Paper text:
M-phase phosphoprotein 8 (MPP8) was initially identified to be a component of the RanBPM-containing large protein complex, and has recently been shown to bind to methylated H3K9 both in vivo and in vitro. MPP8 contains a chromodomain in its N-terminus, which is used to bind the methylated H3K9. Here, we reported the crystal structures of human MPP8 (hMPP8) chromodomain both in free form and in complex with the trimethylated histone H3 lysine 9 (H3K9me3) peptide (residue 1–15).
To explore how the hMPP8 chromodomain selectively binds the methyl-K9-containing histone H3 tail, we determined the crystal structure of the hMPP8 chromodomain in complex with the H3K9me3 peptide. Two histone H3K9me3 peptides bind to the opposite faces of the hMPP8 chromodomain homodimer, respectively. Structural comparison of the hMPP8 chromodomain-H3K9me3 peptide complex and the free hMPP8 chromodomain identified a newly formed β strand (named β1) by the N-terminal residues, which exited as a loop in the free hMPP8 chromodomain structure. This β strand is induced by the contact with the H3 tail peptide, which was observed in the structures of Drosophila HP1 and Polycomb chromodomain in complex with methyllysine histone peptides before. From the complex structure we can see that the H3K9me3 peptide binds to hMPP8 chromodomain in a cleft between the N-terminal newly formed β1 strand and the loop connecting β4 and αA. In addition, the residues of Gln5 and Arg8 form van der waals contacts with the residues of 98–100 located in the loop connecting β4 and αA, whereas Gln5 and Ser10 form hydrogen-bonds with residues of Glu101, Val102 and Glu91, respectively. As demonstrated in most complex structures of methyllysine peptides and their recognition modules, the trimethylated K9 lies in a hydrophobic pocket formed by three aromatic residues, Phe59, Trp80, and Tyr83.
Author numbering:
A (entry chain E): 4 to 15
B (entry chain A): 57 to 114
């Protein structure tokens, strides 16, 4: 199974 | 915290870095995020599937 951290932030 | 990746949808560069667009399993396109290549060490197979697809179309 393929997994990764999800980015919840980013440029404002 | 970590989530399951359904597939890789697209790629782009910004600021000299590669990012990939991720469809998160169990979510819809409204939840799609751009992710740094560094975050994707465990997405070998889905990254390759994407890369092959892009190669196919050229």
């Amino acid at each position: 199974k393929q997994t990764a951290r999800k980015s919840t932030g980013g440029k404002a | 915290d970590v989530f399951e990746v359904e597939k890789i949808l697209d790629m782009k560069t910004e600021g000299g870095k590669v990012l990939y667009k991720v469809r998160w399993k169990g979510y819809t396109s409204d939840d799609d995020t751009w992710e740094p290549e560094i975050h994707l060490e465990d997405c070998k197979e889905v990254l390759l599937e994407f890369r092959k697809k892009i190669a196919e179309n050229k």
